[PDB]
Coordinates of C-alpha atoms and ligand atoms in Angstrom, one line a residue:
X1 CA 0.0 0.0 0.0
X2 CA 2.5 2.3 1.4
X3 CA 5.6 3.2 -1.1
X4 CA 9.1 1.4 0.4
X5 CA 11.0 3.2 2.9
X6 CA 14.8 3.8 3.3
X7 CA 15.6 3.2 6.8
X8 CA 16.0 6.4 9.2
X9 CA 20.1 6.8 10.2
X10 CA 18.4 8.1 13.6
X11 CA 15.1 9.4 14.3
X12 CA 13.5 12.5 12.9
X13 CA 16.5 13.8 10.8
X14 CA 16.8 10.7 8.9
X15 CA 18.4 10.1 5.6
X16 CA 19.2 14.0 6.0
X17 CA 22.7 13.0 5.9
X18 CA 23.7 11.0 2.6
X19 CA 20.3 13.1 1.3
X20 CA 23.0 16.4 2.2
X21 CA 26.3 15.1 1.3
X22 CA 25.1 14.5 -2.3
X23 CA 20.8 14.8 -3.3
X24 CA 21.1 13.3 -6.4
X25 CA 23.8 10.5 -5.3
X26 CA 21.2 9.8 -2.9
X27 CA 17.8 9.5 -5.1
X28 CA 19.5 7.2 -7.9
X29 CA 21.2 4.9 -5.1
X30 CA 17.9 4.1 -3.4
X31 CA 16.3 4.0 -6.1
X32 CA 17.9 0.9 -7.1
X33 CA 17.5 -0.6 -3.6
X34 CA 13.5 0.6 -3.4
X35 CA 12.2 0.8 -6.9
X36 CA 10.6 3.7 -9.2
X37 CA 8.6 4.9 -5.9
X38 CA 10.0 5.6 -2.2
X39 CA 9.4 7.2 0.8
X40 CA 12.4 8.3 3.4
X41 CA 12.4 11.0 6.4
X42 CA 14.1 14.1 6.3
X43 CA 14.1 16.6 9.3
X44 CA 11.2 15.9 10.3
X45 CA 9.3 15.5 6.7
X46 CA 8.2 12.4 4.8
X47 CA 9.3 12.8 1.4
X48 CA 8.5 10.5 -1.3
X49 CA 10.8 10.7 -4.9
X50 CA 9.3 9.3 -8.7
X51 CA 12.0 8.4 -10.2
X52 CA 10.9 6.9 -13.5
X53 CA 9.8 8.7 -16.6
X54 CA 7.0 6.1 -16.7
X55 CA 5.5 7.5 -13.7
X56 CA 5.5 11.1 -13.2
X57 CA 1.7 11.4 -14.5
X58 CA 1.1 11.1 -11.1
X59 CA 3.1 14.1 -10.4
X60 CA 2.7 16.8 -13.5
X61 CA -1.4 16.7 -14.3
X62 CA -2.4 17.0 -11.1
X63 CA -4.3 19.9 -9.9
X64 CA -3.4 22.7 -7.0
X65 CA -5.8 21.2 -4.4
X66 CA -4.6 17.6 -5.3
X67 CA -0.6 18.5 -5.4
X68 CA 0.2 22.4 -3.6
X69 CA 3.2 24.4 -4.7
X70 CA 2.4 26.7 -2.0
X71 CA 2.6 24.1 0.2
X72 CA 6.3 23.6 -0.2
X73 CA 7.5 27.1 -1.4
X74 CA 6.1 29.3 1.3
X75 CA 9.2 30.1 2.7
X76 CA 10.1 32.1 -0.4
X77 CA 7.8 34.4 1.4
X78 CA 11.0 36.5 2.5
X79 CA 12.5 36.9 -0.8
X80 CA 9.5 37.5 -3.2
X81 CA 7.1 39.3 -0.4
X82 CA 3.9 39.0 1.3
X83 CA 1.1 38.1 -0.8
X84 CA 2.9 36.8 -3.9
X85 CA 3.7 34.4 -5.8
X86 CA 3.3 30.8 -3.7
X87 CA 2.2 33.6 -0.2
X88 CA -0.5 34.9 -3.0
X89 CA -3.8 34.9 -1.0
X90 CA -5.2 31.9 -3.5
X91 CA -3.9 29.5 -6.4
X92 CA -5.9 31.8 -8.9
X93 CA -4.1 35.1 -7.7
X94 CA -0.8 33.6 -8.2
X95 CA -2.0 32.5 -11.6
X96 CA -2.7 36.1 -12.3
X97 CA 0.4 37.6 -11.1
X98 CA 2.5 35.0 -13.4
X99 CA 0.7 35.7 -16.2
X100 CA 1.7 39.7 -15.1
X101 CA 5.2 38.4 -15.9
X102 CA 4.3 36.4 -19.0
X103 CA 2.6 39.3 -21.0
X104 CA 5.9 41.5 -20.9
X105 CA 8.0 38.4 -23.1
X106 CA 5.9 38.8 -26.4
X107 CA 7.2 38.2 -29.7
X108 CA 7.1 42.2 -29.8
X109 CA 9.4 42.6 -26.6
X110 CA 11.7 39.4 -28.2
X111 CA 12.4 41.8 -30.9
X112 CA 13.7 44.8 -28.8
X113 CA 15.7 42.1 -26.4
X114 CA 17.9 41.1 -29.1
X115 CA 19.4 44.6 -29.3
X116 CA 19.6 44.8 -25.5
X117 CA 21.9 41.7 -25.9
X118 CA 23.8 43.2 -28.4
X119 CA 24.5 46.5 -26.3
X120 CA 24.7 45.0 -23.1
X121 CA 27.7 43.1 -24.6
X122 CA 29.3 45.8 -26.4
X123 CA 29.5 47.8 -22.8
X124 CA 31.2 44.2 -21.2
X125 CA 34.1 43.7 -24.8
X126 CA 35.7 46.9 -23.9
X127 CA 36.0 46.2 -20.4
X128 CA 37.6 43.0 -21.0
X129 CA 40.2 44.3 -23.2
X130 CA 41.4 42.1 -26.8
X131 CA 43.0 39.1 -24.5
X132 CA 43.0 37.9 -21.2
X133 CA 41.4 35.3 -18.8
X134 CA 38.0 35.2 -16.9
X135 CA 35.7 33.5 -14.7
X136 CA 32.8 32.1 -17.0
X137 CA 30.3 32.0 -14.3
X138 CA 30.7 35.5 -12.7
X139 CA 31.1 36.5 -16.7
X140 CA 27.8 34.9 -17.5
X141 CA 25.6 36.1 -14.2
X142 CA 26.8 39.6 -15.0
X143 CA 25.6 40.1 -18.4
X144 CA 22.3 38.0 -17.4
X145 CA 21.4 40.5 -14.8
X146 CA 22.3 43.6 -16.8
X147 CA 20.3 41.8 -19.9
X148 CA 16.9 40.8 -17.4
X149 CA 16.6 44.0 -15.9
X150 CA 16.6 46.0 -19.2
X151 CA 14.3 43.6 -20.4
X152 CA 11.7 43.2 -17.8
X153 CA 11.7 46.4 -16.1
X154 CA 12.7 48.8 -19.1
X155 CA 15.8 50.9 -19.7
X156 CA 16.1 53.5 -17.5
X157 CA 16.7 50.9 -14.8
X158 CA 20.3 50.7 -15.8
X159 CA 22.3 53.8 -14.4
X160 CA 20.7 52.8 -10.9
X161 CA 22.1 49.1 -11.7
X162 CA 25.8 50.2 -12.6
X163 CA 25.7 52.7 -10.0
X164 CA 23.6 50.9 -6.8
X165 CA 25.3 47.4 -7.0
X166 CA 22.3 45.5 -7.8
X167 CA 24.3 42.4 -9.1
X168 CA 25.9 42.7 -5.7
X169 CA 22.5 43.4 -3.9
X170 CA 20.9 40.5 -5.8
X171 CA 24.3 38.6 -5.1
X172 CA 23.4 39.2 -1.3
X173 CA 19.8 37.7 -1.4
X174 CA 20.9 34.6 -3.3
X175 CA 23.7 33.9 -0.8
X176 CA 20.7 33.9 2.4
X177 CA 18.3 31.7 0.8
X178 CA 19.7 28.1 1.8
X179 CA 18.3 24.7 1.3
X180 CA 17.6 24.7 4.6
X181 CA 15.0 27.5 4.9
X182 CA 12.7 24.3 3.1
X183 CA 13.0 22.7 6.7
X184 CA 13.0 25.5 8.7
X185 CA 11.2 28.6 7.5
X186 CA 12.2 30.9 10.2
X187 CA 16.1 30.3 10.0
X188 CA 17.1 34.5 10.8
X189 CA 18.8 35.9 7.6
X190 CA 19.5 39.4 8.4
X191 CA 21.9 40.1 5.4
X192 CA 19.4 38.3 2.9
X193 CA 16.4 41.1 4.8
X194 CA 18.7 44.2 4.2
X195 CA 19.5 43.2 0.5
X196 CA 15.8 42.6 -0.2
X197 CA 14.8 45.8 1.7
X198 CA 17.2 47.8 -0.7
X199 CA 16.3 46.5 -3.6
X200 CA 12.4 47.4 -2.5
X201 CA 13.6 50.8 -2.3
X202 CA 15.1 51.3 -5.8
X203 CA 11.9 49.1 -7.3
X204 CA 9.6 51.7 -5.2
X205 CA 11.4 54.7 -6.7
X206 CA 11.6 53.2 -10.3
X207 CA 7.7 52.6 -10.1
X208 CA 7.2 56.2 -9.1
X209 CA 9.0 57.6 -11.7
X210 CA 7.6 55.4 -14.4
X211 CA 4.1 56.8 -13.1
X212 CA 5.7 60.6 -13.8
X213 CA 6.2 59.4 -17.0
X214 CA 3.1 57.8 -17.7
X215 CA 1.5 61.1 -17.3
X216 CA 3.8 62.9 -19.8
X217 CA 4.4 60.1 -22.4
X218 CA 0.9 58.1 -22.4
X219 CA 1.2 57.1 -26.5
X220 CA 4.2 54.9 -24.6
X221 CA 1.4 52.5 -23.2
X222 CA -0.5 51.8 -27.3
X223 CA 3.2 50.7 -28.4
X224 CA 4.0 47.0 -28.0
X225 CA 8.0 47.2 -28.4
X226 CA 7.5 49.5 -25.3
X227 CA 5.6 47.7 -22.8
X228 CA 7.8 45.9 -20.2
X229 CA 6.7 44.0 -17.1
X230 CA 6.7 47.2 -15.2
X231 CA 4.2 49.0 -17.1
X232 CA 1.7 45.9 -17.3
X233 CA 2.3 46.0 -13.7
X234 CA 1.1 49.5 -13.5
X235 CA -2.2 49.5 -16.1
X236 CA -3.8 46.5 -15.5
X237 CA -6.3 44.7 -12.1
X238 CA -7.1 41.2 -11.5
X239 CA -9.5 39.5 -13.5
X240 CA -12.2 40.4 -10.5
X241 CA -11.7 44.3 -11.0
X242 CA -9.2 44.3 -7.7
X243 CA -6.2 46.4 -7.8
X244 CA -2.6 45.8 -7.3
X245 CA -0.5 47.1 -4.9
X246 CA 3.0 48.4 -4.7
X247 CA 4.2 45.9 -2.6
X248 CA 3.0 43.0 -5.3
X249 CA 4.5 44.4 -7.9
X250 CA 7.5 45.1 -6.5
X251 CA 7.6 41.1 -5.2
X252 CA 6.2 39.9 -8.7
X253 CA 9.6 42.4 -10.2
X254 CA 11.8 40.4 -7.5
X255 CA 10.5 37.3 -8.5
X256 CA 10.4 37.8 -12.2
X257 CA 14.7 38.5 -12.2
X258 CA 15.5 35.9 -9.8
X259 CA 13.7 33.2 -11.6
X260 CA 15.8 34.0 -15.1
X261 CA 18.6 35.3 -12.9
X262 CA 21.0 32.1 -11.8
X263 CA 18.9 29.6 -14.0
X264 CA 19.9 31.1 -17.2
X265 CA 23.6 32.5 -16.4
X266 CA 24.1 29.0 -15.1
X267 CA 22.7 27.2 -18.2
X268 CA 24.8 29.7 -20.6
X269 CA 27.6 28.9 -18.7
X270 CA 27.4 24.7 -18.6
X271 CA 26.6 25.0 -22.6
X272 CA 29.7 27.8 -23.3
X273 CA 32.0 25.3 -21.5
X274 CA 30.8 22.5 -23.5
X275 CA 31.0 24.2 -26.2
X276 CA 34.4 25.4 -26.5
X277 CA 35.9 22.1 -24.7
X278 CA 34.5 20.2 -28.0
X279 CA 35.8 20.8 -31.1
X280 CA 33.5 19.1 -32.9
X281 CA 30.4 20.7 -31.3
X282 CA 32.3 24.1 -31.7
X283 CA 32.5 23.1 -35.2
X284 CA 29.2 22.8 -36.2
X285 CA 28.2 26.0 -34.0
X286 CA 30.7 28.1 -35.5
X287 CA 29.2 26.5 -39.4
X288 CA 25.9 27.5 -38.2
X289 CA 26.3 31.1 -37.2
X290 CA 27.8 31.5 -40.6
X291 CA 25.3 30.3 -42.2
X292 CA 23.0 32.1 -40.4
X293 CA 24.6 35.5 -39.8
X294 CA 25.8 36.1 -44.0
X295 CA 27.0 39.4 -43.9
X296 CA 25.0 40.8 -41.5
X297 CA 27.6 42.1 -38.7
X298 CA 24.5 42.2 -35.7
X299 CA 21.5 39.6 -34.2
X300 CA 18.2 39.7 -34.6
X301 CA 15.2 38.1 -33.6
X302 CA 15.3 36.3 -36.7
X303 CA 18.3 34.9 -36.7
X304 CA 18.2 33.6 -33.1
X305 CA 15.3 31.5 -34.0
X306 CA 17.2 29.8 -37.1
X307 CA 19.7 28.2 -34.7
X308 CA 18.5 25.2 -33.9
X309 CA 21.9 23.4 -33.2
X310 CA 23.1 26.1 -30.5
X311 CA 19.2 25.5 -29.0
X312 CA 20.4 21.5 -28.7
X313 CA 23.8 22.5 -27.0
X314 CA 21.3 24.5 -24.7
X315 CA 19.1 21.8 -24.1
X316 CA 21.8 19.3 -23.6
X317 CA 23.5 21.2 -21.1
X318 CA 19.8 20.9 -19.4
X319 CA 19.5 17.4 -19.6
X320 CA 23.3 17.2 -18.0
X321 CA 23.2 19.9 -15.4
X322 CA 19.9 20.9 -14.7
X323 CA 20.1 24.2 -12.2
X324 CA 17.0 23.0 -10.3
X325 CA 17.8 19.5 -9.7
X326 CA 14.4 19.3 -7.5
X327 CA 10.5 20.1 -8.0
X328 CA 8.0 19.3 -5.7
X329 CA 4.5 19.0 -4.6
X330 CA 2.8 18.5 -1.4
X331 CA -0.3 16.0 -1.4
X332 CA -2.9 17.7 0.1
X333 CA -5.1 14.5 -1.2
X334 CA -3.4 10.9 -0.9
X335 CA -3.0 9.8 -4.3
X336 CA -2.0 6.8 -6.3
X337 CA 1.2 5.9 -7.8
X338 CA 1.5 2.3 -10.0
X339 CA 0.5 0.0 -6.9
X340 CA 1.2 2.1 -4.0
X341 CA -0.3 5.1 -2.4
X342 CA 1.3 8.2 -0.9
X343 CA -0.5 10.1 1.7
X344 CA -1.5 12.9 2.4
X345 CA 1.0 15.3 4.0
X346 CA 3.6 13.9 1.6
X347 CA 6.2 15.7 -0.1
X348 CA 6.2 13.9 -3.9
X349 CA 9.5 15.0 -5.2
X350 CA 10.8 14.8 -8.7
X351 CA 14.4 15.2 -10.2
X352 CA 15.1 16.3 -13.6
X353 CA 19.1 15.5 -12.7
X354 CA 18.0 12.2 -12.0
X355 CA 15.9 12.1 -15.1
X356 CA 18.7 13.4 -16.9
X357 CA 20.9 10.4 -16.4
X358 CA 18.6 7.7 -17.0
X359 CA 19.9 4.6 -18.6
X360 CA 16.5 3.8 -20.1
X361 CA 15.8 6.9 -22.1
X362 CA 19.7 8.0 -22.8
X363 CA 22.5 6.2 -23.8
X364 CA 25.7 7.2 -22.6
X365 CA 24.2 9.5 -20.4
X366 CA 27.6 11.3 -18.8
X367 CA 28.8 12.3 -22.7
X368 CA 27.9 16.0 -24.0
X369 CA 26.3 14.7 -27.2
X370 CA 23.8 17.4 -29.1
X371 CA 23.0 15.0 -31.6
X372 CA 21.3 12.2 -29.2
X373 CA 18.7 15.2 -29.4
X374 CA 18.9 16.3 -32.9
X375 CA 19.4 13.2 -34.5
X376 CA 18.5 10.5 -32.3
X377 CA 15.4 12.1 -30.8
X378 CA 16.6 10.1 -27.4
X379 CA 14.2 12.9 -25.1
X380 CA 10.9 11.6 -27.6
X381 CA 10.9 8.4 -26.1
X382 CA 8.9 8.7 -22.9
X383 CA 6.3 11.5 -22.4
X384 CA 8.2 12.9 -19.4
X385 CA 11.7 11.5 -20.3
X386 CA 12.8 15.6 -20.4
X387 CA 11.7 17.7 -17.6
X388 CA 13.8 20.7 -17.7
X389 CA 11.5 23.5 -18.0
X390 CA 9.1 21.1 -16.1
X391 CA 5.2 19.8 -17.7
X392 CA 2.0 20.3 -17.3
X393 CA 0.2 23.2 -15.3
X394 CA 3.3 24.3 -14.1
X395 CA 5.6 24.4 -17.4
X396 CA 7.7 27.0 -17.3
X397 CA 6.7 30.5 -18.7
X398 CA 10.2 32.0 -18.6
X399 CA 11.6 29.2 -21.7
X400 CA 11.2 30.6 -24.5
X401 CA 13.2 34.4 -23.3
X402 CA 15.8 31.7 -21.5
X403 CA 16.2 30.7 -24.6
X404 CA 16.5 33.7 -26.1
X405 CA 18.8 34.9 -24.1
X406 CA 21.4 32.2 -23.4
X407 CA 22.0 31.6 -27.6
X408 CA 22.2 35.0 -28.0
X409 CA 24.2 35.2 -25.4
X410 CA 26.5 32.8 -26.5
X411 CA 25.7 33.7 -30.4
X412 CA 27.2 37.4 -29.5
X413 CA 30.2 35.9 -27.8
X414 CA 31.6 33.8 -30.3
X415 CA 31.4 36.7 -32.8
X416 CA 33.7 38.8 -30.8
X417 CA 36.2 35.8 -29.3
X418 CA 37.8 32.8 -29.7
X419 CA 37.5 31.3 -26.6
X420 CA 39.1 28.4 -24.5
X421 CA 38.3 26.8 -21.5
X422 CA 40.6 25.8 -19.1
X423 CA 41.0 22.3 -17.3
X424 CA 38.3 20.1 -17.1
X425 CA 34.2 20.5 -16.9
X426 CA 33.7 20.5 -13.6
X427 CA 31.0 19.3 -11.5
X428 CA 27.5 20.4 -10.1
X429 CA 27.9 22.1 -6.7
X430 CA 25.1 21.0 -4.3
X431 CA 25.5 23.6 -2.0
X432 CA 23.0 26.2 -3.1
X433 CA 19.2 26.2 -3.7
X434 CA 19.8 26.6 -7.6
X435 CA 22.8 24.2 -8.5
X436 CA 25.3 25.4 -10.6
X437 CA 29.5 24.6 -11.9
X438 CA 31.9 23.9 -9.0
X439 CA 34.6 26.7 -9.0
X440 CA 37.1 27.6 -10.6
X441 CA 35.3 28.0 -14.2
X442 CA 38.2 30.1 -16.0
X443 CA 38.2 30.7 -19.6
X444 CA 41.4 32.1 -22.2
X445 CA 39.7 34.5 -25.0
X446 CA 40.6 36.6 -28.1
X447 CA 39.5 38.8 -29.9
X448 CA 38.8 37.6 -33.1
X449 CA 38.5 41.6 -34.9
X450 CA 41.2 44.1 -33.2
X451 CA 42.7 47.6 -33.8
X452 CA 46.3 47.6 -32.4
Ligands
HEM1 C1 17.1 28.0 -18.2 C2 16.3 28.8 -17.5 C3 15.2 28.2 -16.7 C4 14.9 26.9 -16.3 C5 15.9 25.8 -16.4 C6 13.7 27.0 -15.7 C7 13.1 25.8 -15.1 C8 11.8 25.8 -14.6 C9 11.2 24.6 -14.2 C10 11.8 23.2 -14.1 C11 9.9 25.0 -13.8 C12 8.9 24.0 -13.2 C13 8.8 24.3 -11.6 C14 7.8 23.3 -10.9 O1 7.1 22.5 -11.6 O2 7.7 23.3 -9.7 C15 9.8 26.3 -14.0 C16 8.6 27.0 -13.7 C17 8.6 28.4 -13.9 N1 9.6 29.2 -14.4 FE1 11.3 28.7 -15.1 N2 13.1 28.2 -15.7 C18 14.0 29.0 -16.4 C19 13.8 30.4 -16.7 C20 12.7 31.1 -16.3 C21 12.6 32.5 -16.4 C22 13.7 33.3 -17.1 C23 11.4 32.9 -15.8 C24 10.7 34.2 -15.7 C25 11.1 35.3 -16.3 C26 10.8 31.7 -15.4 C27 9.6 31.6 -14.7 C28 9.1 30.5 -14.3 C29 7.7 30.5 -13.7 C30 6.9 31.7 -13.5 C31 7.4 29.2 -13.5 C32 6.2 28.9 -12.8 C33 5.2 28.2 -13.7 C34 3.8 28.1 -13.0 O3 3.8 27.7 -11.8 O4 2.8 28.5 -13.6 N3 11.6 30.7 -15.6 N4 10.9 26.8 -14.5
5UR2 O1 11.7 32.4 -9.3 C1 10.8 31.6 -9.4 O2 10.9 30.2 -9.1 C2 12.0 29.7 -8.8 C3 12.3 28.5 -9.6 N1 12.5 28.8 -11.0 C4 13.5 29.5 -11.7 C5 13.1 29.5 -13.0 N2 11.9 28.9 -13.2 C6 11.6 28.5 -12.0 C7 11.9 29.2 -7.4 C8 10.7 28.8 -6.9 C9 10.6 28.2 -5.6 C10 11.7 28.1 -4.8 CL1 11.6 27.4 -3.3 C11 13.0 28.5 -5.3 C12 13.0 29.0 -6.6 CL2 14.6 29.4 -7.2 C13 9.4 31.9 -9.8 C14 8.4 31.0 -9.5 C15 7.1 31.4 -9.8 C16 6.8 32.7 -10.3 C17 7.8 33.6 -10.5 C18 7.5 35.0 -11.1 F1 6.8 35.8 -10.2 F2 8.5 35.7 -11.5 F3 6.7 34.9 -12.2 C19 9.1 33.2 -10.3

């Protein structure tokens, strides 16, 4: 009836241990001893892990009084705010302020994001100078944040951003949100507070003076190129005629940077190493920007969309090192899963790094290979055999701009630099709630056009 268990180390904290030392070591171990379903306590919390392709049904089609996110992601509370996002007041209201989020990456907005990219780069090429060494990650989470916040919250953002830290202030939050604060919601951050608090500030004042300028410039608002997150956030209610406040859309802002924050500028950086450590992929990139690019010297939207092989590297790089190697779903009903079921108060976890790995979808799972994708159409097998983005009512609604932005990212750098890396591809670091390369990540590069 009831799912195996692993046995408890002691009791309450349970398999916290091995589950610490290494999550994903953990779930594909037991996983062989217990089968595609099991149960196993952890600080106080029974969590049960799907770990076959085959069964996560169970998981992605439920509905948010059968399986909660705000159940288990609560304790964002402190980061994205009161009243938002998974601390909305219902389901429906957090539906409303995602969507918020959603209508400010349109194709029209895509358009205008390409030439952000291209700026945003141009700015970073002279301060690295025509040779020289740098750290990929740091590189990568720069330009992300620079990119996102000129793309979600308009332009005249980005004088604040070079001169009031907010990399660093953004840096600040991320390093007080542990794992840990999953357990225990109340574990005192004060450094993670003040960060948050100052970057409230800044959002307040940047909402203010958009609303001076909404007065002046109103033929702003008809324009679809125009309209970032922060306006919709300003001109438009809930579907029930209510009105947002300040202190929402400043959380649904927060929210809407740190979700394509450390995602994306950790997914360009696992597919730029990959890249440029295979000559053979790096091949077959270079061919296709070539191709693509003619004698054009600058991106656009257009061309972005005609690289289908960088897109594989992308997704590759996903199916390898997936940035959120967990999702999860508390059972507020119990619910069936092949001859077992799980109980309510259960925490049904699945892995995409686990996923990821699997024998019975890929072969040769620990190889950087875009053609098992592109060729071999290894991820078509099962339903749920790729979960990156995640399924169902839940898919992601940030992929496409990811997208977006990590090829032409990575599109932009290859035009200016020849690029190496140096040593070996690391591994994932477990030591973070969003997982990402193990430092050092150091890269040589070269200007591939120079004048002296
Ligand atoms: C490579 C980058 C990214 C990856 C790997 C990623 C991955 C995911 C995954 C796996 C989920 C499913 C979560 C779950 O089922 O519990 C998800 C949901 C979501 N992602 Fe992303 N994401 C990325 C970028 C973005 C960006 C840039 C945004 C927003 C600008 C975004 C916004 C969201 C939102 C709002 C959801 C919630 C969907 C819902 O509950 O309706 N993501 N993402
Ligand atoms: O940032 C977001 O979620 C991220 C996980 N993540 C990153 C990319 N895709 C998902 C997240 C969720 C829960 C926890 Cl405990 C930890 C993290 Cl990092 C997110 C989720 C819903 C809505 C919104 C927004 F308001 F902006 F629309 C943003």
């Amino acid at each position: 009836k009831l799912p195996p268990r692993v046995p408890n180390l002691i009791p309450y904290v349970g398999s916290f241990v091995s589950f610490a030392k290494n999550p994903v070591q953990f779930i594909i171990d037991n996983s062989k001893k217990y089968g595609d379903v099991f149960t196993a306590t952890i600080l106080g919390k029974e969590m049960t892990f799907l770990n076959h392709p085959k069964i996560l049904d169970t998981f992605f089609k439920a509905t948010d009084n059968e399986l909660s996110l705000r159940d288990v992601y609560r304790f964002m509370r402190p980061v994205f705010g009161t009243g938002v996002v998974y601390d909305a007041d219902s389901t429906e209201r957090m539906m409303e302020q995602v969507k918020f989020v959603s209508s400010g990456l349109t194709t029209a907005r895509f358009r205008v994001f390409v030439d952000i990219f291209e700026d945003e780069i141009a700015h970073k090429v002279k301060e690295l100078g025509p040779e020289g060494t740098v750290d990929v990650a740091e590189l990568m989470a720069d330009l992300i944040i620079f990119t996102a916040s000129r793309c979600l919250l308009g332009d005249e953002v980005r004088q604040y951003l070079s001169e009031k830290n907010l990399g660093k202030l953004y840096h600040d939050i991320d390093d007080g949100i542990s794992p840990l604060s999953f357990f225990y919601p109340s574990l005192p951050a004060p450094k993670r507070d003040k960060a948050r608090k100052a970057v409230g500030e800044i959002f307040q004042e940047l909402l203010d003076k958009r609303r001076e300028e909404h007065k002046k410039h109103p033929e702003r608002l008809l324009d679809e190129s125009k309209m970032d997150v922060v306006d919709h956030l300003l001109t438009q209610k809930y579907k029930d005629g209510q009105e947002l406040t300040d202190v929402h859309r400043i959380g649904i802002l927060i929210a809407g940077l740190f979700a394509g924050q450390h995602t994306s500028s950790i997914t360009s950086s696992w597919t730029l190493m990959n890249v440029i450590s295979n000559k053979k992929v790096l091949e077959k990139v270079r061919k296709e920007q070539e191709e693509i690019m003619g004698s054009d010297k600058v991106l656009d939207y257009d061309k972005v969309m005609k690289m289908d092989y960088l897109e594989a590297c992308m997704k590759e790089a996903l199916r390898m090192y997936p940035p959120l190697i967990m999702i999860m779903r508390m059972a507020r009903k119990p619910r069936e899963c092949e001859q077992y079921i799980i109980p309510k108060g259960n925490i049904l976890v699945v892995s995409p790094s686990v996923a990821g790995r699997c024998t019975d979808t890929y072969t040769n799972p620990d190889v950087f290979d875009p053609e098992r994708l592109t060729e071999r159409k290894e991820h078509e097998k099962f339903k749920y055999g790729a979960v990156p983005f995640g399924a169902g009512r839940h898919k992601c609604i940030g992929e496409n701009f990811a997208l977006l932005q990590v090829k032409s990212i990575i599109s932009i750098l290859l035009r200016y630099f020849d690029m190496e890396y140096i040593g070996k591809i690391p591994d994932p670091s477990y030591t973070s709630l969003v997982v990402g390369p193990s430092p050092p990540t150091r890269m040589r590069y070269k200007l591939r056009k120079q004048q002296h």
